[PDB]
Amino acid sequence: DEGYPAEVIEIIGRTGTTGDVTQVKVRILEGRDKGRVIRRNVRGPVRIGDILILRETEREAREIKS
Amino acid sequence: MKRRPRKWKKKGRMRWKWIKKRIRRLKRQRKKERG
Amino acid sequence: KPIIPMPRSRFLRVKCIDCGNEQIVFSHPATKVRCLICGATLVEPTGGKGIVKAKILEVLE
Amino acid sequence: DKWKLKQWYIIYAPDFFGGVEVGLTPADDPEKVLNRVVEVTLKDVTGDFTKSHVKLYFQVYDVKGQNAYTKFKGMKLARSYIRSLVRRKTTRIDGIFNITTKDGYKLRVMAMAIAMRRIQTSQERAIRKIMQEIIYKKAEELNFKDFVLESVNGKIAAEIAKEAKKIYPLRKAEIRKIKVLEEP
Amino acid sequence: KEKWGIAHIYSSFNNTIIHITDITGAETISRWSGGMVVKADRDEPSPYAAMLAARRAAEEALEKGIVGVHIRVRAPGGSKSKTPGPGAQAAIRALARAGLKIGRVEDVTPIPHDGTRPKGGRRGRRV
RNA sequence: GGGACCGCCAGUGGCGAAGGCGCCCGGCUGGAACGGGUCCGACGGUGAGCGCGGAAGGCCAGGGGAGCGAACCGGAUUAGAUACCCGGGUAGUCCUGGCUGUAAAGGAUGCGGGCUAGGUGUCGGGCGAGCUUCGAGCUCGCCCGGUGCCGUAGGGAAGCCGUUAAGCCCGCCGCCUGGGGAGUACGGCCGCAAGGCUGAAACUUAAAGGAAUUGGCGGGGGAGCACUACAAGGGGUGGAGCGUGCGGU
After folding, report:
1. Please, what is the Cα angle at E83 between E80 and E89, to 5 degrees?
2. Between A and E, how many CB-CB pairs are < 8 A?
3. CB-proximal positions of chain F, under 7 Å
4. Neighbours of D57 (CB within 10 A)
5. Nucleotide nearest to D83 (CA to C1')
6. Does Ribosomal protein appear among the keywords (chain B)?
7. CB pair distance less than 8 Å for D24 and E23
8. C7: phi > 0 → left, psi -120 to 50 → alpha, else beta; which?
9. Sheet of A37-43, strands arranged across
10. Would you give the distance in Å from CA D166 to the centre of its chain?
């Protein structure tokens, strides 16, 4: 299980088709990109400062286009 | 052969370009069989 | 619009620099203006007011 | 397999470019290495990052054993850089000229100028003519290598802008591309 | 001396091709299309086929003494489209993530000054 | 090697009588506006008859034929495909000489003069201020011409227009007289041809047509709603037997 936990800081807004996917900003707490801030999505309810587990750090979500 | 703009409105009508062309084909064949 | 057209061109009593020659010249010359004695140019024609080079003495209407 | 049959030959930049080392190429035979174009950036040769946009193509032609010596094919500015310069409500003035150098190196150079605003065509003709005569001059007094380096630092573009101020200010004057057509 | 090669990443809306060549671009090292890694023609341009094929070519290059790479992005160019396909970015990320030291990443789409009449007729591809 | 084409610069730039006209240099020519009345002295305006050039495409003769692509040939889609999509592909699209005289060639607005509140930009010429690394190189006012946009009065069924008029006067030319029949029949003239320029009648019709109002609708566009919808989560119908209803007999 090569996973990487990261800490939520800021919530960009409800994303995805149905809004059930939530866009947040997360700081990588361990790994090759320590401290790096990435825009990442969250299925299911989330809050500030949740520890979310990543399989790949490189993947990123496009900026929410209004 | 001075086409009326009124006829170009497709309401209740066929496209004028093709009616013009049909008249021309008819002209062709009629002048042909005449001589 | 002015009812009676008044010319925007005056005439100029001028003194040439070299040979001390007085002359009457035009404000909007269509061609070159040259001195009688020395021959040097006096005012250059352009799109508008001629390009004076000598000294203007008096402005005639 | 074949890939084990290859061996690496080092390349060397032209002498007038400081004879710097850049890279190596694997070849199965030395004869396959000749006339080999290599695309380099002046930041690599001189170390100067400020002029990273400029690129030099070197045609590799001389092989002594494992070592490869090259000739200067040509120069091109970075397309992204040129795109960045070009903006709307601005003119683009392009001067193309074939030219012989003092030492018989024949060449095509085309040069770039951009002003702040939209300019009259005759003034562009004057710009072209002035830059034209200047580059003719610099070709006459300077040989191949020195002229090449003088163009590389762009000081030709500087004097070009200096004289072109007398017709209209220039947002940027430069030499977009250079092709050594043939040698004497 | 650190070894640098060229990674030509061609991307249309139908396929993506990753070709790794020497510094002169005259000798082939690794050349993997989208078709190598998927079984539906529709899937060739997808970013997953892209990143999988790209990683495969990348490890192959690494095995052959390659460490650094200059990326050359390419759209179809010419009269054909100019926007690289959706898989080019994914493949670039994959090449980065496969342990290759990335240098210049530029576009090399040949843009014409005045090209031939494009395809499709006068009234366009009337989808 | 080849043939076409001349990107960004391009704009509500420019020029042209119009269709139309953009790579750089040199030559040849046509002019226009601006400033000067230095000249002539009504030499005008319009134009039936006449004459000229005039997009694409087509045609006659010769060359050329990169790409594209009428016809045509395949693949796919479909109840059907003579299409839309895809793979090719002839005439064409290019140069030379000639013909053909056509288009939503539309500002759907024939041209010349006199008058008529304004606001504002750019284009170009001229003038006057301010700036200046001293290039009419940069900001502001005015005058003239072209080009918009807004707009008073005024017009018009309304759309809208409005000093660049579609308001009011003066000069000339053309065109129009309900709708189809029909831009046809006959005839004439022109063109090698396809066609072009003139062109009726019978008979038949109560409308055709124009502008705008409301609703409606869009396999249009934005905003916002969740339970007769959906996303998260959750139960169960339809397979067996019965109660009861509807159709069926």
Report:
1. 135
2. 4
3. 3-11, 22-26, 34-38, 66-70, 84-87, 103-104, 106, 108, 123-128, 133-135, 137-138, 143-144, 179-180, 182-186, 194-199, 208-210, 230-232
4. 18
5. F8
6. yes
7. yes
8. beta
9. A37-43, A21-28, A4-15, A51-54
10. 26
Whether residue C35 contacts residue C21, with contact meaning beta carbons closer than 8 Å, is answered with yes
List the E117 CA – F74 C1' distance (angstroms): 24
Angle made by CA atoms A22, A23, A29, in degrees to the nearest 5: 115
| Contact of E67 with E96, CB cutoff 8 Å | no
What is the rounded distance in angstroms from the CA atom of residue E108 to the CA atom of residue E77? Answer: 9
Sheet holding C41-44, edge to edge: C33-34, C41-44, C51-52
Which tokens is E108 given? 């090399």
Contacts for D135 with CB less than 8 Å, ≥ 6 apart: D95, D97, D99, D109, D111, D156
- Binding site of C for Zn(2+), by residue number, is 16, 19, 35, 38
Strand-pair category, C51-52 with D36-41: unpaired
Six token digits for residue C61: 């209407």
Touching chains E and D? (3+ Cβ pairs < 8 A) = yes
In single-letter form, the type of residue at position A64 comes to: I
Q: How many angstroms separate the Cα of D17 from the Cα of each of A31, D72, D176, D183, E110?
A: 43, 9, 19, 18, 29
Closest chain A residue to E96, measured at CA: A58
Q: List, as one string, the DSSP characters of chain E.
A: ---EEEEEEEE-SS-EEEEEE-TTS-SEEEEEEGGGT-SSGGGTTSHHHHHHHHHHHHHHHHHTT--EEEEEEE---TTS--SPPTHHHHHHHHHHHTT-EEEEEEE-----SS----SS-TT----
How would you list the strands of the sheet with C11-15, edge to edge?
Answer: C22-26, C11-15, C55-60
What is residue C35's three-state secondary structure? coil
Integer CA distances (angstroms), A21 to A43, A52, E103, in order:
5, 14, 35
Q: For E74, phi and psi rounded to 5 degrees?
A: -145, 125
Nearest nucleotide (C1') to alpha carbon of C47: F35
Question: How big, in percent rounded to 5, are the helix, strand and coil portions of chain D?
Answer: 35, 40, 25
The rounded distance, in Å, linking the Cα atoms of D28 and D9 is 10
State the Cα–Cα distance between residues D179 and D74, nearest whole angstrom: 5
User: Cα separation of A21 and A44, whole Å?
Assistant: 7
Beta pairing class for D67-76 and D21-27? unpaired
